[PDB]
Design brief:
This is part of a larger assembly, with two copies of chain A (about 300 residues) and two copies of chain B (about 190 residues). Chain A is α/β, with parallel strands linked by helices. Chain A is about 35% helix and about 10% strand. Classes of the chains: A alpha/beta (about 300), B alpha/beta (about 190). Chains B, D: Keywords: Cytoplasm, Initiation factor, Protein biosynthesis, Translation regulation.
């Protein structure tokens, strides 16, 4: 009898497929929590799932996609707790709704492409940043559409993700180079469109993914090239920062301590930046193309009370 | 060539007594049969008007405090599709001098679509009336344009019949008058 | 009897000291060329040195500091050819001037510090980019002045230079971190002053050094932090580009070829960018503090005719 | 508080007949004994003048087409050191509205120095005349400023008695009137 906390349920099926990502894995674990542990009373169910979400955030704090999944699960159990079935059917009604995310959010990524293929037009040199697999889910259907384009992939120092794209869509058959991440300003005068992928959307439209998407965003603004971001609808999160600095990793982004003998010195600054709403200009979700004030309204309506 | 700006700039002098003047450029060779008619209709109600040409609008851009756009259609970005020409550049000179940009628009001019590829929503016209030589064999190629797009960044406010709205608040009026279903208005659901 | 071309004179004394840099090594080689090979006629002397400068540029083309040294040597032999000594004394007069650069340009780097220490004020967090040793020659005398500051060093991908500073002034005893090069935009809101070092100055004031000094410059402009550059007076070069793209490395900055089996994919974009005159605001040379229009006049007067 | 702008704004009406008006802010609590005298001297030669306070200059910044600075000293950047106060922020509101910024300056006001640390060239004054309570024991700390620096980016042109010059062309006038030697004017050559 599993306890669903850390790895007795969650981290097992992350090794089943390296295509499922973190937040829908969190959705799958949280629905299979109360799919079995349903002790016929509406009180301790919500206590169990709130305890489970807080210990799962307590497992890995610096992967804020997890917070997005573990909080839209609370929105799911709140709205499915609504319609007021007196808990007599909801013990069966909520769990038969249940797996509609793993039948729904799993097949959201081609629904992204079905509305985002009509962005990359003919002969567009494209800049992507980091292994954001929804961007590749758009680009796969774009190359299957037989449309002519070129791609440029940045480095993802120190998180290594930029080396994956050049070994991902090269074998699909797209002419692609791998620029280094510092060389954006000398090339973004030539890049037609730039895509990124978020690990979170704030309450105004923000990109909380990686090391330097604020840098490539402010390069996109002072080259006046359109800065799109491909995401999907399990990436909304309540966390609305105000600076370019989020929750810390373990200390401040500006360390000034002493290296003892030979410890690592690359990851000493920040690793997850923030982008304001001005630098993004259109984001892609399951809900269509979505201007950032629309994503602000969409995350302002389902989070108030 | 918009009846909205014409009726508004007449009724701003007819009922209210706010005196001003209106620079007007011609969209050669399209609004040059309309901008002079526009100046004639404003000189009949004698509001201090004067016609600038297209090339002489940057010199007079520092003097002018405000532009106004009578558009044709406006999308969910607020990136509108205008009349004949001029507005893709003079609104840019307005943005670069931090000059405010108005846009009056009827509510029927909305569209729940999106500017996916911006040239596909732009009506390039014919090459007859920009050089009447009709070069037979030398045949210098040329380009006309009967539609100028503005982005929402260059534009400042929308004056509609249901109030004033931000360019970043045009989506919600559309979803107050349209649905999610009829934007891909096609039986062959691909 | 040496021939002074490639390595029979030049590359030997580069292994003598890893403190001398490329252009003053070029100055030393070009003065020791005609310090010995002076065949008593003003005709073939200039042919010899022009042939030597062009073959030395032909040796390594992508190290434009070499072009700066090999062209200010031509300015030296032109002005020392001026004053019109009828070549009777100039066979001795020019060579006894001679080594005044290796007595002058070698000791220019502390003359940089004697006028640039009064920039880094009390409690200034400093951003440097790349192993520009004139910046460390300023910072060494700054830390010897016992003034209180902090430093932040970027990566220098792919040219590795950012790892050298953290193993250079740490052992001098300065609190310093090593930020990754993509994380500039999330930290440059906090950095007080930013220094770089050029591998060249164009005819308007430009930074032709490394991969991404245009990126850190345009981040400095949209954070409105002052963007200084420490250099010295053997770094003037005639090469005045107009784009953000210089002479190529071997092909364009946007490759789209095919990797054959496992060849290197990091250095596929550009490696030497360009900065316009707007983003720099003050540069430091032997000639004092120098606004970029002053460096434009100084490189406009000694290069016309 | 500059006799240069006062004599120029009198002689612009006395000989030439260019009519205009001049908004003027007070640098409280320093130019408030001078800006009212400035308005009195301009109302004696009756050029349409009006006094704005400091806080009400951003609202009237959109109306005004030009500012002008009577400075005290100007460096080799063109980053000048002005009179009493106000100009570090109102020139910034001029730059952000893309409003041109003048700077009249005598040639003796030059300096071949450099603003090494900008606070050291700025004269912070006394805390007496900004709150006359003289708080004994509660003692809320406070800051006064009698010198506002502008950078050369915020400023546009220099009107001197030897012609008009860019802010990026102030070095060469200095080296036309100074040398390399007397900038570190000190016997103890360190």
């Amino acid at each position: 009898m599993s306890e669903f906390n850390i790895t007795e349920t969650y981290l097992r099926f992350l090794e089943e497929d390296t295509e499922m990502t973190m937040p829908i894995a969190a959705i799958e674990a949280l629905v299979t929590l109360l799919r079995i542990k349903t002790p016929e009373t509406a009180a301790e169910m919500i206590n169990t799932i709130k305890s489970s979400t807080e210990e799962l955030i307590k497992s890995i704090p610096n992967s804020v996609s997890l917070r997005a999944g573990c909080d839209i699960f609370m929105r799911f159990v709140l709205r499915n707790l609504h319609l007021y079935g007196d808990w007599e059917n909801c013990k069966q009604h909520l769990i038969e709704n249940g797996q509609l995310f793993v039948s729904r959010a799993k097949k959201s990524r081609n629904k992204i492409a079905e509305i985002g293929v009509d962005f990359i037009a003919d002969d567009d040199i494209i800049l992507v940043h980091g292994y954001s697999r929804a961007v590749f889910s758009l680009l796969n259907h774009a190359a299957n559409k037989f449309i002519r384009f070129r791609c440029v992939v940045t480095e993802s120092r120190p998180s290594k993700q930029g080396n994956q794209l050049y070994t991902l869509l090269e074998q699909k058959g797209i002419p692609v180079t791998l620029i280094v991440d510092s060389a954006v300003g000398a090339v973004i005068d030539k890049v037609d469109k730039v895509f990124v992928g978020a690990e979170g959307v704030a309450e105004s439209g923000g990109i909380i993914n990686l090391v330097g998407t604020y840098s490539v965003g402010v390069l996109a603004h002072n080259a006046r090239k359109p800065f799109y971001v491909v995401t999907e609808s399990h990436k909304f999160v309540r966390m609305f920062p105000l600076s370019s600095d989020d929750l810390p990793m373990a200390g401040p982004p500006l360390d000034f301590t002493r290296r003892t003998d030979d410890l690592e010195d690359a990851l000493r600054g920040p690793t997850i930046d923030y982008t304001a709403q001005e630098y993004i200009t259109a984001l892609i979700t399951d809900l269509g193309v979505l201007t950032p004030s629309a994503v602000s309204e969409e995350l302002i309506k389902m989070w108030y009370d | 060539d918009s009846k909205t700006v014409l009726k508004f700039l007449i009724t701003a002098r007819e009922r209210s007594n706010r005196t001003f003047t209106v620079l007007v450029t011609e969209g050669f060779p399209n609004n040059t049969k309309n901008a002079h008619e526009f100046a004639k209709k404003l000189a009949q109600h004698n509001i201090e008007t004067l016609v600038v040409p297209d090339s002489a609008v940057f010199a007079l851009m520092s003097r002018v405090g405000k532009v106004i756009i009578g558009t044709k259609a406006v999308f969910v970005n607020g990136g509108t599709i205008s009349s004949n020409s001029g507005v893709s550049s003079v609104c840019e000179c307005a943005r670069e001098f931090r000059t405010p940009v108005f846009a009056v628009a009827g509510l029927y001019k909305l569209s729940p679509l999106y500017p996916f590829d911006v040239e596909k929503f732009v009506e390039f016209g014919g090459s007859q009336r920009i050089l009447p030589r009709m070069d037979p064999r030398k045949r210098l190629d040329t380009v006309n344009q009967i539609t100028d797009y503005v982005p929402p960044e260059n534009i400042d406010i929308y004056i509609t019949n249901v109030g004033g709205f931000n360019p970043s608040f045009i989506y919600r009026i559309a979803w107050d008058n349209y649905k999610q279903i009829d934007v891909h208005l096609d039986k062959n659901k691909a």
